[PDB]
Design a protein around this ligand. Sequence first.
Ligand code: A1JA4
Ligand code: NAG
Ligand code: CA
Ligand code: CA
Ligand code: CA
Ligand code: CL
Ligand code: NA
Ligand code: NA
Ligand code: NA
Ligand code: NA
Length: 471
Amino acid sequence: YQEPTDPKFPQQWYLSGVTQRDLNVKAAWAQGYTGHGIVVSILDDGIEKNHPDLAGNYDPGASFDVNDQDPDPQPRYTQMNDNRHGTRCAGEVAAVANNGVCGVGVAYNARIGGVRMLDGEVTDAVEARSLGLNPNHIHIYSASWGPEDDGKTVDGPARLAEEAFFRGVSQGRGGLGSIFVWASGNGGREHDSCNCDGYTNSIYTLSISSATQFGNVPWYSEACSSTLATTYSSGNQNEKQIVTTDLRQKCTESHTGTSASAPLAAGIIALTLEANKNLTWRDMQHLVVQTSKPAHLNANDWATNGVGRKVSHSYGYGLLDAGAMVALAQNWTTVAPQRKCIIDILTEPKDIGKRLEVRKTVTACLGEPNHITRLEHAQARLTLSYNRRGDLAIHLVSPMGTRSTLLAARPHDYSADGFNDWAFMTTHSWDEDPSGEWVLEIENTSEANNYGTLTKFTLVLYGTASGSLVP
Ligand SMILES: COC(=O)CC1CCN(Cc2cc(CN3CCC(CC(=O)OC)CC3)cc(-c3cc(Cl)cc(Cl)c3)c2)CC1
Ligand SMILES: *[C@@H]1O[C@H](CO)[C@@H](O)[C@H](O)[C@H]1NC(C)=O
Ligand SMILES: [Ca+2]
Ligand SMILES: [Ca+2]
Ligand SMILES: [Ca+2]
Ligand SMILES: [Cl-]
Ligand code: NA
Ligand code: NA
Ligand code: NA
Ligand code: NA
């Protein structure tokens, strides 16, 4: 195997490193996987399709302009280069290799397109028409953005967009399911908590956070239990950043944020899908859980879950490992059909006050076709009133003792509107048996005499009842 000759490939430290602080992408390339035959679409502000490092892989069938309602996602050029982000992300996935220009994509033989959707008013319909673009041609969608990362917003896909997610994972990709890769957010400095973003909090999105070059949680990171895994991105000014294609046929070394991590994950997922085109959307999440690596990622919340995997709310299961992903994909056995066990828990509304604990022992739909002994995602769908929402912290403890933070205190969130059946999601109990006692904790983290009521707590379990590995 001959590594890329591109002039900035040596600067793509998160691919080209020899110090073990990388995504182990060369190992996948050397196994023969480069993204050939895979189609990825960047949902963003457009894609410079004539970029000298993108044109060779550009796919009009992976592209659309839902802002101006036309097929051509060319960015709108402005003096401040506002609409450059999709071009940066496209190059992360699929910049052409060995062509003397900039660097390379993770999946440098994949086909790449973009949906121009962010350069205009983003409505439910705009979102739905983007997520649902050409779903039997595009394999993987990469989305780096969502509701405002101001640390006070609770929002997610409205009806058309949620319908697009279910159509995508159900009928997309020939019934194997569209793979939606999401950035978990850039709201770290606002103390944002990313389960309050319904896109990344969705089970249908494969959510990705960031690590700095030196292995730390970047200033912009949001912690939450819905995150699955991590890719490298930017950090402080002594740490390198992401090197990629840039608007106006240029090359940048200063692409940043969690919004730069999702495209790298989408590229690794493209290599993995080349290794096994039959992988379902759930198979892909299983591969990520099993192969991601905590080592050398620094966080104070690494915890071992009930099946012996380390998990963090900053990193999920750790750094993506492309070599391991493609290796495990090759002989992967398709997971059983997804079961869903609904457990409505409260017999009466519960005053929250300073602190509320709700304990419930469940059988996880024992005796039913939705009996789950092998958890995938779990949700606590909560309906509650509270006078100041951001003073709440919420935790969910599984029978195996895994404490998932569902909501951390958000100091800027002054809302008196509470949560209306908000489906806080955790990935941290993946592969655990969910039978037994679950504990919900709701706490007022402020000294204020805050008040409210929990009126609904629905525990929703997803998963299967066969095929477990030894912990
Ligand atoms: C009843 O109907 C409704 O309520 C319809 C609503 C429509 C808006 N929805 C949230 C939303 C917003 C934006 C726009 N904007 C926000 C600021 C951000 C930057 C930042 O946070 O700076 C601190 C940049 C994005 C975008 C995306 C988005 C993005 C991608 Cl890439 C894909 C998809 Cl599907 C959606 C989603 C909620 C539903
Ligand atoms: C894909 O997986 C399904 C489910 O296991 C199986 O029925 C089908 O034969 C597989 N197709 C290929 C091409 O491997
Ligand atoms: Ca256009
Ligand atoms: Ca190149
Ligand atoms: Ca956020
Ligand atoms: Cl469902
Ligand atoms: Na975001
Ligand atoms: Na997700
Ligand atoms: Na544990
Ligand atoms: Na149990």
